[PDB]
């Protein structure tokens, strides 16, 4: 009767219902009554029994939009001594025909104009809108405008919040606070920051200490709930943001403002600046002894890049930098190598695989594709990050406090009897586990007995879907690829609501509680599921935008490379045709089925192949191709390619 409409191939979809059961229902176009992707419909069965899988539906009334903007391209002509408007939506799920306001047109206002509107009065008998322009972004075949559409597509938020930043501005240092007695003053130690060198999140410094019976590790983390107070101005924007947007060229969109972003929450060499620690004891083979978290005071001693870091590694270059800071970075080393050899002992997957970036010019144009290498110094630091992270989570549950969890849950056994069986036709071996029972060891040694498959790609992309994706959640759920029944994330405040979550949990319960009331502890906890629920949907919606904009860039760079010769592999197969992913740039192209040469090619469903009627000739995930790019597809942003 009620739930949420996703448009698909062709624009026709599926609504799934908002009861306990989620039931799907399909919707062909023809019988959406004006609704759009994403929107929350009222809905009925269709009185034809069922073709198969599941009912069919009809839309009835629209009860909430997804948008109230949409982006799209200004058209302006004159015929006749008459001005035509036309507007061309960007996204190819806007299927209704518009007829815009001509009172919303400037008189200026250009055709090629990038502009967002809203709709003003539909028609769902016709498809019929009336729309507005609302907003003028700029010149349509501006890269960095077409990013900035994207965005707003997705409903993220970019536009500096003014009203925010002066509220930030009012912010300063207090000397006194680290006269506070909860506060351990850490000035002395020779902490340090290793990030990428254009990135400004500097809001985690770590020292390492040699004991006699192994080592104390350090994770300070810049202490954002100290400075953001639970439902102020400043948070009340981070938690509608969720977190920091990422996108090419190193364009950031912050999840809080300047001044704390880049200076009171930036942990900047020679600066004192309050944090949270997570102190670690290990003994000398990386097992955890002892654990303490507390609010503290630290001087960064210095600023690393990765590739700094990596190049004193290979002797390849030398860091200007006092000698206790040489140590604790050897210790770092020694110490996260211990701490990877534990964590594979105990079980942990690693789905490291191919990843790469888009380098774009000062205007925003895209030049190639970049694979991403592994990097001794980001193992390093994540590694320890993660440590700190599991510990964090586990110390919050010891003391019964409610928290999101970062969870991640066994795949089930039907998918992973898929997977086995896809990637068996590889020559991947088959894993000799209980599949029920499997565990995140068990994982790992399939993985590794594989790795000089030339199919091993394949065979973690594959995994990777078969596992899904990481969510938060209160509830106590494993997270199955780190491999520890209980994680959270805690490290990255300045850029992750959730983290900023479980700082305000520390203070509220462990550090200061008798400055709160157990009616604001009581308020949070009863807010932590809505907390969590908000930001996976948000998460889902910034995955699109970075995918909505890798495919706008691709295929705007791939549009200069038609007739082109591509090696690759299958990577998905689907009844309107393959997906090849192209070696040089990593990309997923399109193969149209009916376009295949040599024989009739038939979609099988269970097996996920094309099989000619003829020939029996096969095509599988996995398989290696050479096809020519044909033509970009500037509607879809696809890349279409045909064998040769
Ligand atoms: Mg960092």
Not at 514 to 521: V, Y
Request: net charge negative.
């Amino acid at each position: 009767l009620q739930g949420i409409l996703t448009l698909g191939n062709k624009n026709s979809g599926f609504i799934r219902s908002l009861d306990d059961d989620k039931t799907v229902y399909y919707v062909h176009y023809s019988n959406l009554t004006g609704a759009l992707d994403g929107d929350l419909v009222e809905f009925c069965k269709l009185d034809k029994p069922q073709f198969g899988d599941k009912f069919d539906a009809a839309v009835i009334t629209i009860l909430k939009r997804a948008r109230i903007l949409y982006a799209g391209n200004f058209l302006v002509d004159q015929n006749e001594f008459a001005l035509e408007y036309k507007i061309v939506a960007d996204n190819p799920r806007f299927y209704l025909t518009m007829i815009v306001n001509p009172d919303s047109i400037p008189n200026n206002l250009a055709s090629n104009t990038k502009i967002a509107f809203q709709i003003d009065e539909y028609d769902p008998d016709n498809n019929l809108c009336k729309v507005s322009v609302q907003q003028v972004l700029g010149n349509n075949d501006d890269p960095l405008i077409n990013i900035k559409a994207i965005m707003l597509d997705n409903s993220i938020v970019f536009e500096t919040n003014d009203v925010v930043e002066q509220h930030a501005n009012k912010l300063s240092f207090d000397t006194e606070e680290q006269h506070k007695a909860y506060r351990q003053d850490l000035t002395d130690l020779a902490f340090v920051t290793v990030d990428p060198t254009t990135s400004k999140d500097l809001d985690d410094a770590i020292y390492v200490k040699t004991i006699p019976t192994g080592f104390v590790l350090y994770v300070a983390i810049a202490d954002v709930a100290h400075y953001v107070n639970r439902n102020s101005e400043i948070d009340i924007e981070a938690k509608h943001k969720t977190s920091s947007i990422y996108l090419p060229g190193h364009y950031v969109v912050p999840m809080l403002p300047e001044q704390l972003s880049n200076q009171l929450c930036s942990l900047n060499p020679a600066q004192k600046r309050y944090v949270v620690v997570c102190e670690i004891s290990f003994d000398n083979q990386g097992r955890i002894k002892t654990n303490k978290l507390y609010p503290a005071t630290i001087i960064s001693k210095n600023r690393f890049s990765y590739d700094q870091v990596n190049k004193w590694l290979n002797n390849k270059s030398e860091l200007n930098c006092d000698e206790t800071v040489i140590n604790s970075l050897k210790a770092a080393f020694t110490l996260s190598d211990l701490i990877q050899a534990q964590r594979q002992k105990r079980g942990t997957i690693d789905l490291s695989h191919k990843e790469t970036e888009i380098v774009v010019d000062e205007h925003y144009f895209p030049i190639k594709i970049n694979f991403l290498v592994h990097d001794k110094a980001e193992t390093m630091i994540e590694n320890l990050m993660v440590v700190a992270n599991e510990t964090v989570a586990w110390v919050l549950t010891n003391n019964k406090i409610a928290l999101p969890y970062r969870v991640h849950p066994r795949p089930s056994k039907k998918k992973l009897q898929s997977l086995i069986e896809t990637v068996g036709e590889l020559n991947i071996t088959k894993p000799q586990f209980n599949l029920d029972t499997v565990t995140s060891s068990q994982i790992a040694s399939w993985l590794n007995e594989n790795k000089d498959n030339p199919s091993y790609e394949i065979f973690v992309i594959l995994l990777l879907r078969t596992l899904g994706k990481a969510f938060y959640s209160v509830n106590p759920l494993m997270h199955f690829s780190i491999g520890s029944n209980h994680y959270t994330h805690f490290t990255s405040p300045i850029r992750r609501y959730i983290d900023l979550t479980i700082h305000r949990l520390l203070w509220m319960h462990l550090f200061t509680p008798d400055q709160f009331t157990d009616n604001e502890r009581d308020q949070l906890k009863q807010e932590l599921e809505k907390i969590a629920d908000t930001v996976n949907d948000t998460e889902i919606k910034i995955i699109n935008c970075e995918r909505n904009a890798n495919d706008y860039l691709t295929t705007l760079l791939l549009s200069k490379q038609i007739g082109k010769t591509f090696s690759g592999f299958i990577s998905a197969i689907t009844s309107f045709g393959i997906f090849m992913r192209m070696d040089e740039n990593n990309f997923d192209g399109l193969i149209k089925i009916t376009t295949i040469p040599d024989d009739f090619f038939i979609f099988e469903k269970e097996k996920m192949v094309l099989k000619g009627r003829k020939t029996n000739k096969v095509y599988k995930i996995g398989d290696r191709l050479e096809a020519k790019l044909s033509e970009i597809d500037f509607i879809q942003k696809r890349a279409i390619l045909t064998l040769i």
